[PDB]
Design a protein around this ligand. Structure first.
Ligand SMILES: [Ca+2]
Lengths: 217, 56
């Protein structure tokens, strides 16, 4: 764990992917497109926006069905390399104070940059959006923690001493640094274990693929 | 029964929250567990029927 409950609607680009229940997160990058992790693929997905407590109808939510789901063409289910996926919504959503988009990276954020990670974890009890402030770690530290498992399309975010980390339910969610989406919650060995910080898809390596895909679809 | 049916459920390294079934040797039946979305082991089923058929 280690996170804290986010201030209500303070992360307006955060979405919940639901196929009967919440199973993954995602980010709204424009009024009709969401970015998430490829391992979050399901044939039928309902996107829920403007959420805080996913177990109660609060009044600010928008429920929209996914029209097209496009996984990165080179996604590897074993290594998790290229763990990224785009979802086009059935219809554009209404952008407001509680539902907004997040900017794609203008470049790759350097190690040491402080970021915000968010998501819901693992029927009437409150299930509130959680937040965690954590820095991007240097590649060498990431590699040392996961020998032979880190590719150039991944980045570690968190603490080598563990204690604070993203966990199950968080996959596909945003890692935002200086107002730009720099990572997507992907994997890790356990959660919050020392010497095994979370691994995230490095979004700056995919800006052109994202833009090219949205334009062609 | 097969050896993989006696292994504890495996969440895996991915961080999705997907409910799957696994055969619980001590209980004598299949129960649910949270699967992470990648690298599933064999004691992981999309339905109790399948789980009970394969590991019952
Ligand atoms: Ca709600």
């Amino acid at each position: 764990k280690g996170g804290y409950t986010c201030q209500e609607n303070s992360v307006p680009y955060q979405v919940s992917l639901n196929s009967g229940y919440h199973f993954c997160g995602g980010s709204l990058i424009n009024d009709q497109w969401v970015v998430s992790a490829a391992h979050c693929y399901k044939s039928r997905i309902q996107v829920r926006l403007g959420e805080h407590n996913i177990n109660v109808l609060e009044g600010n939510e928008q429920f929209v069905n996914a029209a097209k789901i496009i996984k990165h063409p080179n996604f590897d289910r074993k290594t998790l390399n290229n763990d990224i996926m785009l979802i086009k919504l059935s219809s554009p959503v209404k952008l407001n104070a509680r539902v907004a988009t997040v900017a794609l990276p203008s470049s790759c954020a350097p190690a040491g940059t402080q970021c915000l990670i968010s998501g819901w974890g693992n029927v009437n009890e409150p299930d509130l959006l959680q937040c965690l402030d954590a820095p991007l770690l240097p590649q060498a530290d990431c590699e040392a923690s996961y020998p032979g498992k880190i590719t150039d399309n991944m980045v570690c975010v968190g603490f080598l001493e563990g204690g604070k980390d993203s966990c199950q339910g968080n996959s596909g969610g945003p890692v935002v640094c200086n107002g730009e989406l720099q990572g997507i919650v992907s994997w890790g060995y356990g959660c919050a274990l020392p010497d095994n910080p979370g691994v995230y898809t490095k979004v700056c390596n995919y800006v052109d693929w994202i833009q090219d895909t949205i334009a062609a679809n | 029964r097969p050896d993989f049916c006696l292994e504890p459920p495996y969440t895996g390294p991915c961080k999705a929250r997907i409910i799957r079934y696994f055969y619980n040797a001590k209980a004598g039946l299949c129960q649910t567990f949270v699967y992470g979305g990648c690298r599933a082991k064999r004691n992981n089923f999309k339905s109790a029927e399948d789980c009970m058929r394969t590991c019952g």
